[PDB]
Amino acid sequence: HHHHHHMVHITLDRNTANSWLIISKDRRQVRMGDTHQNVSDNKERFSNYPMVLGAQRFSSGKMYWEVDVTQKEAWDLGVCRDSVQRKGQFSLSPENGFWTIWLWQDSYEAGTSPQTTLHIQVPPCQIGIFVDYEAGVVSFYNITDHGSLIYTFSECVFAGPLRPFFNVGFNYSGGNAAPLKLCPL
Numbered sequence: 001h002h003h004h005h006h007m008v009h010i011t012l013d014r015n016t017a018n019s020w021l022i023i024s025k026d027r028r029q030v031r032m033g034d035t036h037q038n039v040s041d042n043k044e045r046f047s048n049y050p051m052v053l054g055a056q057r058f059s060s061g062k063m064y065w066e067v068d069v070t071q072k073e074a075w076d077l078g079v080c081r082d083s084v085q086r087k088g089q090f091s092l093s094p095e096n097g098f099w100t101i102w103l104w105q106d107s108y109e110a111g112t113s114p115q116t117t118l119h120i121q122v123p124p125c126q127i128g129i130f131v132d133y134e135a136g137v138v139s140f141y142n143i144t145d146h147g148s149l150i151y152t153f154s155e156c157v158f159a160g161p162l163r164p165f166f167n168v169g170f171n172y173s174g175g176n177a178a179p180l181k182l183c184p185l
């Protein structure tokens with residue numbers, strides 16, 4: 001891929017964060033805290049899962065960013081509609097306004113309904129995410145493996161502004177405390 005030149009500087013939106021998340025001062029890193037982080041509730045916060053949105057909204061053009069997932073056991077990454085459900089239980093699917101991949105229990109899967117098995121030979125430490133709004137494309141790249149393609153959602157029906165989407169995952173195991181980090185341009 002030669003998508004690097006559409007690089008955008010993403011920052012995390014604290015107001016959307018689940019109340020257990022800790023976002024760094026520079027708004028470029030997020031991790032699971034071991035308790036509630038002492039913020040008020042609001043209608044934007046994801047209540048059931050350790051999720052947060054980027055501050056940026058995209059309604060046109062080509063955008064690219066990279067996320068560090070080093071030593072995590074579980075996470076979700078991609079984009080979503082600005083209008084996605086925040087409260088209660090839901091599945092990550094294009095029908096619900098999400099275009100995502102994840103790691104869970106030693107397998108990588110794309111968030112289709114039902115989910116799609118991914119074929120990754122080199123476990124990634126950094127993921128590249130490419131959005132072409134007009135084309136209806138979301139693609140994922142393995143930066144650890146020389147940028148190899150992981151997955152392409154095509155024929156996407158965005159149906160609204162898009163936001164960068166993050167899930168740091170649960171830490172029931174004690175092996176998933178590490179942060180998601182937005183990597184420098």
Ligand SMILES: CS(=O)(=O)N[C@H]1CCOC2(CCCC2)C1
Pocket residue numbers: 018020032033034047048049050169170171172
């Ligand atoms: C991931 S964890 O460290 O096992 N603790 C979680 C237990 C379930 O509730 C939460 C999930 C998000 C809201 C609060 C914390």
